[PDB]
């Protein structure tokens, strides 16, 4: 029952900045704590062991400190190859456990999502299926909530959501949400709505259509 808590889950920054990730233990684990870095498409890589001992070729900007129940990993002057996920691991007792991670992403100006909704295509209805798709493209920050409404009501099931990773060119995120129905259900109702809430608007961002 030794829980490791990493905060914050996401750290949005610009190259040249300094950051410090926190990793807290629910019990004193002395200095038995290591840090790992995981860039996309790569496996984890050991950065620091025993809270503060840096590994062979680890750039000097990576510095770990801490003891007992509080540990901190700092990066002074973040470079672009430092973007990724960072995990802490306790080695105090069994089983060995990791924190949930902290993602370091590239900051940029807020951007409202461009939303598009598409009714089912005839080609799919004829097969007895009904998939309504909603694209939410190029927004920032990452946090976004999408809700589906059928005739002013909420549908929790049959919803498939997928997100792209931060774009290399403009650094925004994108998402698509599909609500999959029955050619039947789809025909009992008339109004279909894609509803989103994002930092860029205090009121819901909505896109809708009636099958008329």
């Amino acid at each position: 029952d030794l829980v490791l808590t990493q905060s914050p889950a996401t750290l949005s920054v610009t190259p040249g900045d300094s950051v410090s990730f926190s990793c807290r233990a629910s019990q004193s684990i002395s200095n038995n704590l290591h840090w790992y870095q995981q860039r996309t498409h790569e496996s984890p890589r050991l950065l620091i062991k025993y809270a503060s001992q840096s590994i062979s070729g680890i750039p000097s900007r990576f510095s770990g400190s801490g003891s007992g129940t509080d540990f901190t990993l700092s990066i002074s002057s973040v470079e672009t190859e430092d973007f990724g996920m960072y995990f802490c691991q306790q080695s105090n007792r069994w089983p060995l456990t990791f924190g949930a991670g902290t993602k370091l992403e590239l900051k940029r100006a807020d951007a409202a999502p461009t939303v598009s909704i598409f009714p089912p295509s005839s080609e799919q209805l004829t097969s007895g299926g009904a998939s309504v798709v909603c694209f939410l493209n190029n927004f920032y920050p990452k946090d976004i909530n999408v809700k589906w409404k059928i005739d002013g009501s909420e549908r929790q099931n049959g919803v498939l959501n997928s997100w792209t990773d931060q774009d290399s060119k403009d650094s925004t995120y994108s998402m698509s949400s599909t609500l999959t129905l029955t050619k039947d259900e789809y025909e009992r109702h008339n109004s279909y709505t894609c509803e989103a809430t994002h930092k860029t608007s205090t009121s819901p961002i909505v896109k809708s259509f009636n099958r008329n």
């Binding site: 050991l46 996920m85 990791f98 598009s116 295509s121 005839s122 799919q124 998939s131 998402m175 599909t178």
Partner: protein, 221 residues
């Protein structure tokens, strides 16, 4: 020049059993423990256990005691891990990693210094099913789409106009549901080029050896 090479990705039907491999090279295979970790889609890392090749001694996470079995083979410089009763929750990427040099005799860091590339595993009872490609037509810029539904297994290769259209494209990662995959892709073009000029998405699913072209035509209703 230390290196850990894991077996290739794999599909498996539920209830089945599986055995992955981790071949070592670059250092004395018997001098170091080999750990096994699982990384779940939400990125969460779990420690499964470790094997000491020099002893065959094993230490495992209480959570995978009767689910995972570790063994090694000195003759082949390879560690193995057997997963039993493969359910859906067992779909994830699995890693083997080396324990770093000891502090002193019998005293370790429990810090992994060299990792394998990872071996993905998907537990689905589906057959190599080609996908159904549906066009997404709207009802200054215009956004069109293609829904690639019900395929297996990954991957699919979506392109727009055979590649002539590369700008303003977003292809979402595939999501598995009901043992079947579903992907979608969007493209945004100037409203002064559609429907005037033709736009079509080309979907290629190698596993079925099926290639498909779907033209995006405006819905007249």
């Amino acid at each position: 020049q230390v290196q850990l090479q894991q077996s290739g990705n794999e599909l498996a039907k539920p209830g089945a059993s599986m055995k992955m491999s981790c071949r070592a090279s670059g250092y004395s295979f018997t001098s170091y423990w080999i750990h096994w970790l699982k990384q779940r889609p939400d990125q969460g890392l779990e420690w499964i256990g470790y094997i000491d090749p020099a002893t065959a001694y094993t230490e495992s996470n209480q959570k995978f005691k009767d689910k995972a079995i570790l063994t090694a083979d000195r003759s082949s410089n390879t560690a193995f891990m057997y997963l039993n009763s493969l359910t859906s929750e067992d779909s994830a990427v699995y890693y083997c990693a080396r324990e770093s040099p000891r502090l002193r005799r019998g005293i370790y860091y429990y810090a992994m210094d060299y990792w394998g590339q990872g071996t993905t595993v998907t537990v689905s009872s589906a057959k190599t099913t080609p996908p159904s490609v549906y066009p997404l037509a709207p009802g200054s810029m215009v956004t069109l789409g293609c829904l690639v539904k019900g395929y297996f297994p990954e991957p699919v290769t979506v392109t727009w106009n055979s590649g002539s259209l590369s700008s303003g494209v977003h292809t979402f990662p595939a999501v598995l549901q009901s043992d079947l995959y579903t992907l979608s892709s969007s493209v945004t073009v100037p409203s002064s080029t559609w429907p005037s000029e033709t736009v079509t998405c080309n979907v290629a699913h190698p596993a079925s050896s099926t290639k498909v072209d779907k033209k995006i035509v405006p819905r007249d209703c």
